[PDB]
Structures are given as C-alpha cells and as structure tokens.
C-alpha cells in the first residue's frame, strides 16, 4: 500500500507527493510556510499541503517537526486544524528527510477577509462562537495556543473557521518589535513575561479579535511593548495589589508600580452602539488578572451565543501527553519518533 509519487518543482524546491494530490499551487505570500493548495481526488476535498524541508537539520528542528506532527495528529474537532494525511517519499528511516502534512483548505485567513472592516453582530457571534468552541477543545487537551491572532484562523466562504498554529509559536525578539500585528493580540503577562503562564492567555486574544471584528479597529495597536501596555492599562486599569503579588517577575512588578494608577474604563462608552451582551463578554474576557478571565467553556454558555450554543455539541479532547517537551534527545532520536508517527498514521472517515 505504498502509493506512487510524482515530482514537481514549486517554491524553488522539488515536491514529491502521492498521485492522489493534483493541481498543486503555492498559497500565502509564503506567510504560512511552504504550503500549496491541492485537490485530493481520493476524498474530493481541497487541501493545504505543507512540506517541512530538511526538518532534522538541528536538534531544535527535529523537535519542532516532532512537536508539530504530535499536535496535528491529536486534534480532531471541526474548529481546529487537523491532519487528513501525513506522508513521506522515504522507503525507510535511513532515507527519511521530508515530511508533508495535509489538512483542510478553507481558502483564506480572517485577516484578509475582515481587515479594516466592521462586522455585523450576528456575523461576530458565529465567528467567535467557533473560536471559543475550538479553544474549549484545545484547552481540554491541556494545550495553549499562545499566538491566537486573525492570520492563523482559517475561514471558508461560509464563515466556517478552523484554528491554525496552536502550540508552535516561537517568534524572535525582532518579529515582536514595534508596530506589529504579531503582538497586538498578546496577553500582557506574556508580552512582558510577568509570570509562569497558562491558558487564559488565549481568552485575552479572543477579546482583542472580538473588539476588532465589532469596531473594525485594532483594540491595542501599540507602537512597541510599553506603548501597547499603556494602551492596555488605560482601558482595563492598572493592576490591583492582588494581581501585583502574582506577578513573579520582580523586575516587571517594580516597573508596573511606577505607573500612575488608573481606573478601568466604561466598555459601553468605548464600544458604543454594541450589543450589551457583546460588551458584557468583552468585559469578562479582557480582565488583566489572568486567574479571573472567563474561560472558553464558561464563555460558550454566555447569553451572547444563545443562538449557537448547544451543550452536547461542544466536545472536549483526550489529554495531550507533552512529556516529550521536558526531554533532551539526539537528532536521530526525534527523527525516529517522527518516523514512527508518520507510518502509524490513520486517516479519518
Ligand atoms: C497545511 C498546514 C499544516 C499545519 C498547520 C498548523 O497549524 N500547524 C500547527 C498546529 C501545529 C497549518 C497548515 C495550514 C496553513 C495555511 C492554511 C491551511 C493550513 N489551510 C488553509 O485554508 C490555509 C491556506 C489559506 C489560508 C489558510
């Protein structure tokens, strides 16, 4: 059952994929990786195929490849990107040096669709419903997206949404620097490294997406980390003494206390004309103290989603075993674990 593969040059690299995959063409400005759209003749689905190129060139690359393939194989929810196929042209471990990952092709990301545009309330309901329903799941598997922004929500022409990139986020100093969308969605505890963080960081990010869809404006379009934080504290207010205690970075805690105290603003005088149910929800997602933000499961029950909420159709995941993260292994060792996971792979129905 080893299929026939054919060769094609795309993205200035040779792609070698099963015959079932036809009409490959690069998508994104290169924004998503080496990703091509293709037709799967075997399932009749349009798919995105991502080739990981020379993916075991270092220990850190052999472990990312493994981590992405683990994450991907774990996720089976309508609103989360998952694997329809993984393959390699390799006939053995010896020969293993390329992994291709196949998932659904939705066609665009939220970014392209809505940039600079204000969405109607029922449109925002449905898109955020799906983000929280997707995140309910992610979070139940004990995984943290950590980098939830519009560009890595994949959306089709029916405004159906799959979340991309959960658990992989590792931007450098310079990608996070200045006036850049790659930071406008980050929870302050994470942008400024205040504490040992958990999953509540992704509900902060939904709060930012949700406000932008509702007003057509970036919520916190900071020109740098500090300017962005100043933008944050002015709306939600400066930390209380409760929160300052939980800020384990003494360094960051000391700079925070430097700032002149400000009250939390009135969200109804910010989000003028907006469904009060939207504003109530914004209010409980955009709380500075991470321990007190609303959760994905709690938010799904909120009245604002009265029209979509079904408690028996909002599933959870099995646990995700990330014990491998705390493990220091050789290149061959990650490679072999990654091989194991490819050949053991089972298609969905
Ligand atoms: C092909 C692919 C493989 C993996 C991941 C991914 O999320 N990995 C991290 C979760 C571990 C995302 C895509 C990917 C990248 C870009 C797109 C799609 C899929 N599906 C799509 O529809 C698009 C192409 C049009 C914009 C979104």
From Swiss-Prot:
SMART domains associated with the record: S_TKc (SM00220)
Impact after mutating residue 51 to R: Impairs MAP2K6/MKK6-dependent autophosphorylation
Subcellular localization: Cytoplasm; Nucleus
Listed name of the protein: Mitogen-activated protein kinase 14
Motif interval(s): TXY: 177-179
PROSITE patterns: MAPK, PROTEIN_KINASE_ATP, PROTEIN_KINASE_DOM
Active site per database record: 165
Entry binding sites for ATP: 27-35, 50
Regulation: Activated by cell stresses such as DNA damage, heat shock, osmotic shock, anisomycin and sodium arsenite, as well as pro-inflammatory stimuli such as bacterial lipopolysaccharide (LPS) and interleukin-1. Activation occurs through dual phosphorylation of Thr-177 and Tyr-179 by either of two dual specificity kinases, MAP2K3/MKK3 or MAP2K6/MKK6, and potentially also MAP2K4/MKK4, as well as by TAB1-mediated autophosphorylation.
Residue numbers of Phosphothreonine PTMs: 13, 177, 260
Effect of residue 31 to V: Lowered kinase activity
SUPFAM superfamilies to which the protein is assigned, alphabetical: Protein kinase-like (PK-like) (SSF56112)
InterPro entries: Kinase-like_dom_sf, MAP_kinase, MAP_kinase_CS, MAPK14, MAPK_p38-like, Prot_kinase_dom, Protein_kinase_ATP_BS
Originating organism: Homo sapiens (Human)
Gene that specifies this protein: MAPK14
Domain (Protein kinase): residue spans on this chain: 21-305
Modified residues (N6-acetyllysine): 50, 149
Main function: Serine/threonine kinase which acts as an essential component of the MAP kinase signal transduction pathway. MAPK14 is one of the four p38 MAPKs which play an important role in the cascades of cellular responses evoked by extracellular stimuli such as pro-inflammatory cytokines or physical stress leading to direct activation of transcription factors. Accordingly, p38 MAPKs phosphorylate a broad range of proteins and it has been estimated that they may have approximately 200 to 300 substrates each.
First-level EC class: transferase
Any one GO biological process: cellular response to UV-B
């Amino acid at each position: 059952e080893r299929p026939t593969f054919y060769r094609q040059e795309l993205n200035k690299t040779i792609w070698e994929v099963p015959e079932r995959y036809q009409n490959l063409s690069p998508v994104g400005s290169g924004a998503y990786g080496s990703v091509c759209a293709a037709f799967d003749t075997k399932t009749g689905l349009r798919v995105a195929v991502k080739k990981l190129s020379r993916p075991f060139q270092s220990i850190i690359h052999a472990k990312r490849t493994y981590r992405e393939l683990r994450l991907l194989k774990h996720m089976k929810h309508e609103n989360v990107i998952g694997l329809l196929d993984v393959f390699t042209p390799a006939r053995s471990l010896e020969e293993f040096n390329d992994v291709y990952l196949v998932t659904h092709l939705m066609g665009a990301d939220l970014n392209n669709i809505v940039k600079c545009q204000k969405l109607t309330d029922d449109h925002v309901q449905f898109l955020i419903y799906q983000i929280l329903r997707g995140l309910k799941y992610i979070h139940s598997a004990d995984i943290i997206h950590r980098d939830l922004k519009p560009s890595n929500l994949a959306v089709n022409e029916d405004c159906e949404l799959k979340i991309l990139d959960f658990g992989l986020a590792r931007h450098t100093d310079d990608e996070m620097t200045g006036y850049v969308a790659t930071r406008w969605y980050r929870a302050p505890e994470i942008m400024l490294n205040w504490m040992h963080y958990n999953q509540t960081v992704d509900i902060w990010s939904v709060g930012c997406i949700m406000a932008e869809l509702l007003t057509g404006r970036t919520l916190f379009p900071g020109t740098d980390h500090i300017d962005q934080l100043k933008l944050i504290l002015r709306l939600v207010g400066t930390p209380g003494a409760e929160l300052l205690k939980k800020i384990s970075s003494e360094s960051a805690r000391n700079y925070i206390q430097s700032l002149t105290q400000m009250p939390k603003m009135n969200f109804a005088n910010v989000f003028i004309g907006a469904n009060p149910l939207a504003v109530d929800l914004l209010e409980k997602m955009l709380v500075l103290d991470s321990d007190k933000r609303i959760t994905a499961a709690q938010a799904l029950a909120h009245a604002y989603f009265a029209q979509y909420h079904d408690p028996d159709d909002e599933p959870v995941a099995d646990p995700y075993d990330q014990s491998f993260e705390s493990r220091d292994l050789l290149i061959d060792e990650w490679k072999s674990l990654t091989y194991d996971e490819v050949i053991s792979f089972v298609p969905p129905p």
